[PDB]
From Swiss-Prot, chains A, B:
Gene3D superfamilies: 3.40.50.880. The keyword Ribosomal protein does not apply. It is found in: Cell membrane; Cytoplasm; Nucleus; Membrane raft. The modification Cysteine sulfinic acid (-SO2H) is found at residue 104. Its EC number is 3.1.2.-, 3.5.1.-, 3.5.1.124. GO terms for cellular component: adherens junction; axon; cell body; chromatin; cytoplasm; cytosol; endoplasmic reticulum; extracellular exosome. It comes from Homo sapiens (Human). One of its GO terms (molecular function) is cupric ion binding. This is Parkinson disease protein 7. There is a cross-link at residue 128 (Glycyl lysine isopeptide (Lys-Gly) (interchain with G-Cter in SUMO)). Deglycase activity does not require glutathione as a cofactor, however, glycated glutathione constitutes a PARK7 substrate. It is linked to Parkinson disease 7: A neurodegenerative disorder characterized by resting tremor, postural tremor, bradykinesia, muscular rigidity, anxiety and psychotic episodes. PARK7 has onset before 40 years, slow progression and initial good response to levodopa. Some patients may show traits reminiscent of amyotrophic lateral sclerosis-parkinsonism/dementia complex (Guam disease). The gene is PARK7. Sumoylated on Lys-128 by PIAS2 or PIAS4; which is enhanced after ultraviolet irradiation and essential for cell-growth promoting activity and transforming activity. Cys-104 is easily oxidized to sulfinic acid. The keyword Kinase does not apply.
Length: 186, 186
């Protein structure tokens, strides 16, 4: 009965959006895919078009959520970083001691909104310098990094690991293992 | 300048749809996401809603394609299996000696349409018995199986491998390696 908010902006990495949504739903998490710009379909980085479940404005009224998830994609992460609405959502989640999960370029939105300073984080290798501007975080090359309530990961190829880490954090290791087996992961 | 047709039906596994589309586009392949039922948005197995690029009817007029891709998801694969339009597309592709790629439950649509009999194939473990009804194929537990122009794979967790195998088949090993590195695969 845990709840996840996935914030979907134009230019989001569609694999990094869909893998966590799908895996979290397999884990019995109630996931809301919320469109940053509104209710309209979102054109992702490789032109996959995804229809959000709700606008972010409407989804926020239905919170709070057990996790807020930020997909990557450079242009998607920049749109998340420039959003006052995302700022408020992340600050409130941080304030209530709720989990925040971000992947690839996604964690650079944490920097933009001054979230989780002092945490160990990872990002896509190409996003490291952006994330580390100012030295506000300590960098990690782990495929998934979790420092308390800040959970980060590196890229499309770590999305399953990222998603299962979220499942483990919310629903426990046993559920994560049960969800993992039918995926045919290596 | 290679071209891929991805046939998207209600109940398709969204990870198995999006990963190949995204990875193939990273490889410079022109991908058409074609809606089986028409141009309308498609509700995937875990409720991700994807807007196709075109209807299958319209996409067929723009062929032929260097690969026809069948995602899995049990209900999606069943819809592919029951479609006369898919039958014609697969038979024509087989007739012109073009590549057909299917993942998870996806290969059971090959059985339904009598495509590639005598090939070595793999499927999701839970789809093995369906696929092997009649003994028309030889079963494999390889994560990706390629027997000439029939390329198969096992599940969401083999989707990157499946996608990169398609890229290698169309654009060569060097391009596949170049596309792979920024994904941060294990």
């Amino acid at each position: 009965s845990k709840r996840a908010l996935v914030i979907l902006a134009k230019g989001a990495e569609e694999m990094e959006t869909v893998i966590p949504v799908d895996v979290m739903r397999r884990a019995g998490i109630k996931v809301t895919v919320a469109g940053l710009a509104g209710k309209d379909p979102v054109q992702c980085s490789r032109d996959v078009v995804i229809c959000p479940d709700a606008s972010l404005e409407d989804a926020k009224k239905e919170g709070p959520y057990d996790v807020v998830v930020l997909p990557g994609g450079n242009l998607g992460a920049q749109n998340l970083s420039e959003s006052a609405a995302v700022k408020e959502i992340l600050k409130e989640q941080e304030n209530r001691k709720g989990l925040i999960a971000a992947i690839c370029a996604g964690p650079t939105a944490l920097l933009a909104h001054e979230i989780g300073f002092g945490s160990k984080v990872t990002t896509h290798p190409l996003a490291k310098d952006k994330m580390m501007n100012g030295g506000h975080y300590t960098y990690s090359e782990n495929r998934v990094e979790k420092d308390g309530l800040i959970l980060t990961s590196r890229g499309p190829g770590t999305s399953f690991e990222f998603a299962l880490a979220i499942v483990e954090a919310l629903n426990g290791k046993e559920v994560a293992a049960q969800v993992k087996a039918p995926l045919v992961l290596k």
